[PDB]
Structures are given as structure tokens and as C-alpha cells.
Paper text:
We recombinantly produced and purified full-length [name] (referred to simply as [name]) and its slightly truncated variant lacking poorly conserved and likely flexible terminal regions (designated FAM118B24–334), both with a noncleavable His6 tag. Subsequent cryoEM analysis confirmed the presence of filaments in both samples. To perform cryoEM reconstruction, we treated filament fragments composed of several protomers as a single particle. This approach produced electron density maps of [name] filament fragments composed of five and two protomers, at 5.0-Å and 4.1-Å resolution, respectively (both obtained using a focused refinement in the last step), and of FAM118B24–334 filament fragments composed of six protomers at 7.8-Å resolution (without focused refinement) and two protomers at 4.8-Å resolution (with focused refinement). Despite the apparent helical symmetry of the filaments, an asymmetric reconstruction approach produced higher-resolution densities than helical reconstruction, similar to what was observed for another filamentous systems, likely because of structural heterogeneity within filaments. Experimental models were generated by fitting AF3-predicted [name] monomers into the electron density maps and refining them to a good fit. The part of each [name] protomer that is well resolved in the density maps is limited precisely to residues 28–325 for both [name] and FAM118B24–334, indicating that the flexibility of N and C extremities extends slightly beyond the parts truncated in the shorter construct. Individual [name] protomers are arranged into filaments in our cryoEM maps. Both [name] and FAM118B24–334 structures show essentially the same assembly where each successive protomer is translated forward and rotated by approximately 40° around the longitudinal axis, creating a helical arrangement.
Author numbering:
A (entry chain B), B (entry chain A), C (entry chain C), D (entry chain D), E (entry chain E): 28 to 326
Write the structure that this text describes.
Amino acid sequence: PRKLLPSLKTKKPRELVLVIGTGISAAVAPQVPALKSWKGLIQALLDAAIDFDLLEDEESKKFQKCLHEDKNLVHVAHDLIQKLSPRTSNVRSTFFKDCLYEVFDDLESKMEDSGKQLLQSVLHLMENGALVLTTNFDNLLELYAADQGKQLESLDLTDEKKVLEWAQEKRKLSVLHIHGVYTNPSGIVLHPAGYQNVLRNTEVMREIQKLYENKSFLFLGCGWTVDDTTFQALFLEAVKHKSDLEHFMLVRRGDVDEFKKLRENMLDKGIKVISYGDDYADLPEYFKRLTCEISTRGT
Amino acid sequence: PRKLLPSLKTKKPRELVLVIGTGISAAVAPQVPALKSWKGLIQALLDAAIDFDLLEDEESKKFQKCLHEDKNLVHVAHDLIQKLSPRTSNVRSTFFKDCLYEVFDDLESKMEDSGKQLLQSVLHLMENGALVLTTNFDNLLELYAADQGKQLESLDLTDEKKVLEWAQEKRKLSVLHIHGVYTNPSGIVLHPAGYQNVLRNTEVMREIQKLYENKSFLFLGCGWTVDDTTFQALFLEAVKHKSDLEHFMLVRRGDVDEFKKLRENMLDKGIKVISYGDDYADLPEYFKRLTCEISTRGT
Amino acid sequence: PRKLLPSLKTKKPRELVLVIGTGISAAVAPQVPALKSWKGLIQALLDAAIDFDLLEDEESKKFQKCLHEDKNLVHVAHDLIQKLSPRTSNVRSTFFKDCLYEVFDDLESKMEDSGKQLLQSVLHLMENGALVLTTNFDNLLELYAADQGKQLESLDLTDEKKVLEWAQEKRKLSVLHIHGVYTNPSGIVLHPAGYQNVLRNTEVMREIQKLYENKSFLFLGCGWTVDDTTFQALFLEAVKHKSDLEHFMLVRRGDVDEFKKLRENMLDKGIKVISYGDDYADLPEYFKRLTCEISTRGT
Amino acid sequence: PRKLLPSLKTKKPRELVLVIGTGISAAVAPQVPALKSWKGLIQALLDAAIDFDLLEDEESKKFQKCLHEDKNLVHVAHDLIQKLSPRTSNVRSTFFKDCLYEVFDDLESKMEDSGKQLLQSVLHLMENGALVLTTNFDNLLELYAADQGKQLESLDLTDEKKVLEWAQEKRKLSVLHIHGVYTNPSGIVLHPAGYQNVLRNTEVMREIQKLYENKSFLFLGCGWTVDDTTFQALFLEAVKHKSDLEHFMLVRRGDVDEFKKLRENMLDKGIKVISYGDDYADLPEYFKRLTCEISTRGT
Amino acid sequence: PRKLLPSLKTKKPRELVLVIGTGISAAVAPQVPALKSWKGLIQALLDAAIDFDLLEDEESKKFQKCLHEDKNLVHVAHDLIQKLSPRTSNVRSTFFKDCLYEVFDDLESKMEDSGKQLLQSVLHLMENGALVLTTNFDNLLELYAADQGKQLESLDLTDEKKVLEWAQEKRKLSVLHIHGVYTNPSGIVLHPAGYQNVLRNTEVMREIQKLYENKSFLFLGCGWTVDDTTFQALFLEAVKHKSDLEHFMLVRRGDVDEFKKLRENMLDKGIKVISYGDDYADLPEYFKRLTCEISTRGT
């Protein structure tokens, strides 16, 4: 039932950037164990590796214990890729690409109108000439933009040249991935070395400063999605000025204390917070009236 | 059924001062109880900040009790401000500013002509040399100043040099606010600290002594607000031979006992109390009689 | 019961190549000395030839002891093309044919419909413009197409004009016995004279090379599908040439270390693999799932 | 092991032509020596039990030594017959006819029942549309076919019309004698003039030469047949298509040279050699099976 | 004894006409002057006439000498007949019939057992419908019918209505004694008057000519019946078919050179010759076996 916070309502779309997270996948296909949990992603890819015969039943017991070894799942996942598969410079090496193509298909069938109303709002924000960044293996945004009649161009960390062009504010039609993409598993980075090899283009950290001070971001995700390791590293090594940052997260009006705690946590982080609702299909209408009223005020 | 007083009409406008409260805002935009009186603004903040989830339940109970209580408006304001403000003030901070922006919400949306005829009348006194001072966040004259082209700006707290030049009659057009500048919400000057913040520039009060002794003052839309502690301190600092002066007042009531007691306190201030304007038209017609001539061809 | 491979699922019918190994025709007739093994084929040919009074024991039983060597026998059988028939080749002689026509018997009667599922799948793929190669003398596919009411043509690597039309997808009416079909024994290409024949008609060599580079093959039967002598010679040179290409072969789970090392060697050549325990019944089931995918990609 | 070879088996009844050589008449009716060879035929001139063989006992011993000499016996038997019956020139007689008829009458108790199985086969194919022809001096087939119920007509090289009307496939229920037959004594020729009768009838030569290139000719008991000067005059003469005829001989095979020798010369003429196991009884077993296959393929 | 010589044995009773000189009686009884050859019948007729004292000395010398000299008997016998059988009213006599009664006396004792076998076989053929004609005026076959228990009707050309029924087969078991008969003196002739007596009924003449062209004729011991001008004039001198005529004669191998010489003479005349025996009994041994063939083929 909720309403425009004037700070946003007064901000112009020209100011804005957004982050994409789990809530879109949770609208589309929340039954999929992996899309709710990265230890569920380990289970799913372990099932596929067993179906492939990459590693034995005794290894399957060790990897089941790895499901129980929660936290730093980003690192555990890098290790599991490398345990299963080499990072070769040559050959379209098989089983791993197939394994992710199997996980990538048959999400598009699931797409709810709840997703379509987020997506239409999002597409208008994109059309306003913004920048967008994603945690998501899921790419529903790119495909559905084509159902809405439009191209979408998707970008990845190892395409560091396009990371730079996104940060330079140049690319319209644009989304950046931190993690998986349908293009090539080789794009993936998950151990800290892969991430920091991109960050070692240190001028990009100075463009992260420019954006993070100057513009206003809005985030979709678990909220812990800003707390995930490379998000912490990339943003916090770029900006020490917790005072001078300029940007928001979206949060669920479930338990009152979850959003209070998160609001204070983000305040302590140097980050801004807004709340909507518990339900995973209450967000779209809230987001729609919010979005068109911002873009029509920007007009 | 209403009349002018000869001593007011016989002064030259350079001789006159005016003091303004909520009834003029009710002439510009009667639409909200907040515009009729400050108590409605408490209900507006309560509604808005609950709708945000920026008021929690015990905070809401305090402000519900403020609506029961009606303390001195200084203490109402301080009570309201202090719980309304969530903060850790190293970061630039936000939420109370949005609450003001939604509670005010850009009153071009609520305009009416009867109030703007009052503004044009008072402003013409200022053209032939009159001065004006006022309580609230109601920048409404400044809306009409942008319509009428007599260049004007809103002053409170921080610019005592400019206040001195205007009180020193070096410039005719400026607007003086007294509660504190709304763009400093946690700061708001409705506290005992406001008495000492005026004392920082007793030289501004020295010109206000000169004005209050020499000039004749007209009081509009005011009430017990001018018997609240900040106005008591201002008046004691302005003159102590307090009864002797000539000043005029127009007011309405809840019951006649208010007007008996108010007329005694007004006369102790030097002020003569009159009643009309159950609806606006009495004041425009009183101003039509006071203007002498609309054609400007006889005199 | 077991997972399709996405990378294989991707391609159009027109895009794909299919090869019918000796294990596959042995699934078309799981009772047949002509198909059980090459050692069995030679043994049965010789023993059947003496059963018709065509030959004498001295050479035959001495070479039978040589069969215990299990090796060189493919070319020793071509040396037997000298030995076995009394020889003239311009006059329409019979004895070599008499053996191979005693061998090409029972035909359809041995087929399970389960094998016919695979053959029907092939027939619908060939209807969509696909292309079929086989290691086998035996036109059981063409006879099955006539059982389901329509012509297929039987074709040889000594009928190079029709091989070129077949290879360009034009002669989809025809099925290419790589070693030649039983019907005309002099035609046969398991003989090194047939390997030379692929060079003698350069268009055959070109079409093999062209098709490897341009398009993806799916290979079926046994390790011996790849390993048998003409396949080893022609097709392993094509993967001595290199472009990191993608191709497919079907295997049973078996000895997993041999399977792994084979899979590695195949990957090093440029081939991708599918592997399951307990042999036959899953191959028709899985192949039919793949067939409807390819069929829907055609339509 | 008495299995059936393919290339012969391919044919339906009308496609085939059957040559009944001297040994089959002997095999069909062995109760008198006279059938059993050309030495038997000449011996029959001596088997005469009446005074009017026109020779001396010393001339009889000379011609007995001609049987020891392996002489020009086809012509020498004619010369002997001309010396046995010099009536005047071409005038009528009884004595040759009396000898012949007394030898040749009463055939059906002189038969084998296994020989009646062979003749059953002959008749069965002939009614199913064959061509049947003989050298031999005996209507054995016609009399046995009358015992079966069939009113068979006997033909020879006197009425060239009847030879050709057999050749047209028209004379169902008829049998054709080339060297001649007893019931028509003045039609018999062992000398060249009988061969000259068909060489003169170029239309019969054209039928035999048509049957030679395209049709299949098969020969039974035929150790001499294909090497008869009469056969070479009747058959080969104009046409050299020997490389591409489709013709067949059966003989008992027990030494390797028997097939090798026979094959080489037969392939020079254009004919295909076939084994049977151990004795002549195997040949009616093979040929009766082949006959019911020819019938069932035809009808 | 003689083996069978089929060509004569073929003939049915109604296909048979038997030619009867004395020679049947010669073979039956070679010891009697009346029987040896037709000159012996005329000698016995002359002997009977001389015992009756009927004839002149110079006529008797003429007859005896002419019968020994092998002259043409027709005129010798006719002269004896007309001398004995004068033809007026008062100068008339029977004597030639009375001489026939003396000549053919006691023949049933005179017969050999071979001769009785011959006559039994002839009578058996006559009862089975065989046709018979005789130059003898005799009762000899009518006497052997009496031996057997049978009787026969005796005719000459001038008994023209009964001879027409004989000739038209209506009187089988009647016998025509061409030259006259023991029942009738006026008929008896061997002459152009005999050709007239054949003509005397033209239907009888036409039947007689028809027999020799159409039927088969058999001659036995015809040591003059070959030369009868009556038999010559129609059969030898007015039938053209001599090459083709299916006629038969039995002659005795008393010398093989007599048989060669007689074969030459008779086949030149138009008469076809068959050879038998050392002595006359060999003809009855064949003739009974032959008679059984004739009757069984006639049945």
C-alpha cells in the first residue's frame, strides 16, 4: 500500500543506477533449490557431475559435507569448479559448459506477470539512460526486454573494458554480471584472485568512487547481497567516506526488526534503506507506481 | 457588519509593521488541518512517517500523546523532533527531511485566490514602506512574490547580517521566519536554545526595539502563539514601556473568553483587538477600503 | 532414465551427421554372425563357404589357428579375397557373391521393433534432410523403410557420384555403407583398395573433410566404431587436423578408467561423449527423446 | 550339405530354360544299357535281337574297338546306322523303326521312381511356363506326363515350325528332341545334317541366342552336352555375349580339379558350375527343391 | 523262334486285308502238291480232272509244262477253268468245282500242328473282324472253321451282292475267292474277263481298289500271287502310293541271300518284305503271337 519517499520522488532518473538480485528469480521460479540457495546450487551441480561421472561416490559424500560447510560459498564454488574442471585457455571443454547450460534452460517458461511488472518498470528506468549491475546467474531481464520489443546488452567482469565503459556512464541498453552468464563459464570468477585481477585495473576503483559518491543506486537482493565478499571488497576499497555515499537498498516489510536491523546495518555501512512488504509478488505494484511517478517527475 | 480604524489608515505605509500567523495560510489553502493550525501538522507527520515505516509504535504513541497534550509549541516541537530523528550523525542523514517534504508537499497544489488578494494588499503596504514578520514554515508569500516580481527571500537563524540590514530599512523586500529554517529539521529553533540564538545578535533586537517603539503594527492569523515563550522573550527584549504603543489585531475564537483575555494581553503589548472574517471576503473588502483607490488617477 | 545433453540437443536436423556402427546393426539383429564381431564374421564366412562345397580345409583351418592371434585379421581377410573364390572378375562369376548372399539372409525377421524405433528415428531424420553412414554391409535400414512403406537406396564408397549427391544432402533417398553393401562384393571398401578409392575420387575425400570442419557428427555402437580400421584411418586424420571442434559419441559406462582415458583421447581429437551402464534399452529411449527435439527444431 | 545357390534361384519359371542331356534319360529309365551312354546307344544297335542289322561279326568287332578307341562316335554311329539301313536313299522302311520302337516302347516300367520325381519337376516348371528341350531318342517325359494326366506332344527338327512353336513358349504340353526320337525314325540325325536343320532355321537360332544372352539356361547330366558339336552349332554360333550370360550346371564334386577344370572352360562359354555332394540322387533332391522355389516365386 | 518286329503287329483286324495264295497252306503242310505254291493248286485241279478222265492229251501236256515253267498263271488257270466249265445251255459242265472238292480233301489231317496253329490264328482274326481275300477258289479256311467248330460263307466276284457285303465288311466271316469259288462254276476266271467281273458291280470294284490304297495288306508264301494280272492290274499297276503303302510280307530265310534278292525284287515291285525262320513252322510261331497283338490292338 506504500508510497514515494520524497527523497526518491525528487531525485531524477538521470541521477540513478540499480543492482539486481534474488527477488526476480523468486518471482519467476522459487521452487528451484539453487536460485534460493548457493549450497542448493552445489547440490544441483553435484547431481549433474554424478550424472556425468566426473568424480566418484566417495567424492559425492565429501561434497555433501561441503553443502553443510555453508559461508564463503563463493570460494567453495570456485574450488568445486576447479576440482571438477581445468580453467583451460584452449578447447571448448565439455562437461562444465553443458552442466551450466542444463541449469540455464527452462526458466523462461516459468515467468510470471509479477516479474513482467517489475520488468516493465525496470525497462523504463533502463530507457532513461541508467546503469545496471547483477548478482544473478539468471538473466530474465535480457530475454524479457526482447519480449517487450527491445535489445539488451549484457556485460561481465572479465570484459573489464565494458566494465570501464559502463562505469564511464557510456553504455545505454546495459547490464553487468559479477558472476555467471549464458555466454561462457570461463567468464566466471569466484576465488578472490579472479575478482582482484579485474580490480587491479585500479582506475575502475576510482570510477566506483565517482559513481558511488555522485549518483544514487537502488538495490535488489537479499540485503546480504551487499555483504557478499566481492561486493564488500569492490565498493569498500573504492570508498572509505561512509558519509559521502548516496544510494539505496530495497527491503521487505516482514518482521519489523529485520528491516530496522538492516537499516541500522546499512547506516553503519554508509548506505540508505527503503522497505516495501514480505510477499514476493507485493513488490511489483509498489515498484510500478514508484517507478512511473519518478520517471514522469523526471520528464 | 465590519469597519476600519482611522489611525491605521492615516499612517503612511513606511510607518507600519505586520505580524502574521496561521489564518493567512488558511486563506491561501484551507485544505488541511495543518494549514489551519500546527496541531494538524502533528497528525500529518504521524500519518506520513507511519506509512513509510519511519515511525515505530512507541514513537507513534508519543506523538499521539502530543495531539492529546498541546504543550507549549516550543516543547511540542522539541518532543516531536527528538524522537522523529533516527540518526548516527557522522553520515549526512535523511529521514526527518523527507517527513517534512511529504507533510508540506508543494502547496501550489492547494492554492486559492482569497489568500493571494490578502498578500497583494499587505505587499502594497510594503511598496509604500511597510515591514512583516511571521512564525511558521509557510513560505506562501514567497510563492506570490514569484508571481508579483517584487524580489523576496526567506530568512531565519543563520543570516543575522541580512536581518540587520532589512531591520535597518536598507532594503524593503525580505521575509522573516521565526520557528527555524525547515531545511535544518533536527536543528529547528523551537527550543529555549532559540532565546539564546536570538541573543547572539541582540543588535537585530535593537532595531526591533526601534521598530516596536516608533511604528504601528498589525496582527493577522496570530493567537496564543505570540504569548508562547519565544514571543514573550522577543517582546520583553523589544519594549518594556509595553502598553503605551499603538498596534492593531484581527482574530477569531473558539469562545468569547479567549477574546477578553487576548484583548487585555494585546493592550499590554500595545495592541487593539478586532474580529471579522468568518469567511475571507471581509478582509479583502477592508483592504479595498484601506487601499483608497484601485484606478490610481485621482490619487 | 538419464539426462539429455544440451550441447547435442541444440542443433538443427540439417546441421547434424549420424554414423551406424557394427554394434548398432548388431542391435538391428542381435543373433547374426555377420554382426556379432569381425573375428566371428570371418570365421562364419569361411565355414559357410565350405558348407556349400566352395573350398578346401588346409588353408582354412591353418588360418583358423591364426585367428587366435586376434590381430591383422582385417587385411588378412582382404588377402583371403585372393584365396577364397576361384578368380575371374570381368565375366559375371559368383563364388565370392555366393558366400556373401548366403550371409545376407534372414534380413528383417531378426529385428526387434526396439531396433526399428532407432531405424524409424533415422528415417524421419533422413526425411528432414539428414545423412547416414554405416560400417556395415547390411541394408537393414533400407529394408525397414520399405516395411514402413517407402524406398531407401543402398549406397557405397565405390559409387562415388551418388556418394557426392548423398554428402551434399541431395540424395537423402540413399544410405551409405562405408565398406560397401553386401549385394556387390567387388564394391567393398573394408579392403585398403577402398581407402585408396576415397583418394581416387577426390570428391569423397573433400566431402569427409568439409563435413568434419563445417558440421557436428554423432557416432554410435562400440569403441570399435572409432577403432575399426577404415574409421581409424580416414576419420582419425580429420582430428589430426584441428579447430577445437564439437562432435558426439555414444559409449557404455563399463570400465570407467578406460572410459575416462578414451573420453580424454576423444576430447584431445575434438569429441564429446555420452556414457551409461547396462547397455541397450536406454539407447532407444534416450535417442527417441533426442529425435523429437531434432524433429521440433526442423519444424 | 545340399543348400541352394542364389544366382540360379533368382529366376521365376519363364526366365529359365532346361536342357535334358543323355545321362538324364538313362537316369530316368535305367532298365536297359542302351540309354546309358553314346557307347550304350551304339550298343543298342547290337542289342537288336533279329537278323537284319546289315553287318558282319568282324565289322561288329571293329566298331566295338571304335568304342575302346574313344573315336568320332557321334558321326561313326551315324555312318554305322547308314550301313545298317541303306534302303535305297530317302525311301520308307520298317526295320530301323522296328528296332527303335522295340527298344523305346514300354518306358514307364523301365523308369526310376526317383527319375519320375525329376520328370515331375520338369513337367511342373513346364506348365508353370518353362522351356524344356533334349538330345535324347526317347519320349520318356511325354509318356510319364501322360501317366500324370497330361497329353504331351513330341516335337523334333523335321517340322522346324514345331521347334519354333515350342520356342515361342506356345506349345504347352509338348517336348522337343534335337538329335531326334524313336517314334519319328526319319527325323533322327547323329551326323551334322541335324545340326544344319537348326542352323538353317535362323529364327530358331535367334530364339536360342536370345535365351543365351538374357535368359538362364541350365543343364542336367550334361557331362558332354555343352561340348556337343550339335550344341555348339545350335547355341553359340553368331553371338559372343559369353561374359554376361546367366547359365548353370550341376555335377557331383569329389576331387578339386573337377570343379576347377569345368569352371574355367564353362566361364569361357559363359556358364556357372555348381556342386552336389556324393551321387546323382542328390541332384533330383537339389533340383526338385529349386523347382518348387522357382514355382512359388513365379506363381 | 522269331522276336517281335512291331510294324505289322500294329495293324487292327479292320485295318488288315490278308492275301491268300496256296502259300498259307504251303506253310501249314509243305508236303502236299496242291499247297506248295499257286501252280501246285492248278496242278492238283488238273490231277483231279485227269482222274475224272475230262481233258485232252495236248491240253494236259500244256497245263503240266506251263505249271513247271513259272509262266504267268492267270492265262494257264483261266484256260483250265473254261475248258472244264463250258458256258452254253446243253454244252455246259461243273467240273472245276468238283476238282476243288477233290483238291482240298482231307486237309485237316494234312496240316502240321504249326499249320493248325496258323489256321486257328487266322480264324481267330476273322472272328475278330479281319479282312481276307484269296486267289484260291478254295474251301480251305471254311474246312478249318469246321475243325474249330465254326463256319464261313464262300464268295466269288460274280455273286456280286454278297461280295459287296463282304467288301463293305457287312459279311465278315465270308471269304472272297477272287478268281471263282467251289460253290459256283459260272463265275470262275483269271483274265480281263476277271477285271470285267470286278467291274461287273462297280461298287465291288471301287471297294476292292479302296482296300489296297487305304488298308494294310499282308502276303504269306505268295510264290505266285505276287504276279496275278488281276491283282497286278489294280494294285501293282493302278495304285501310286508304293513308297508310302503300309503293306507287309513274310518270306523264309531258306537262304539269307534269297531274302536279300527277294527284298530287292519286291521293294522294287512295291512290296515290303519281312524275314523269318529256317522252315515253315517259324511263320505260325510268330503268326499266333502276332495274332494276339492284332486282336488286342483291335479291341
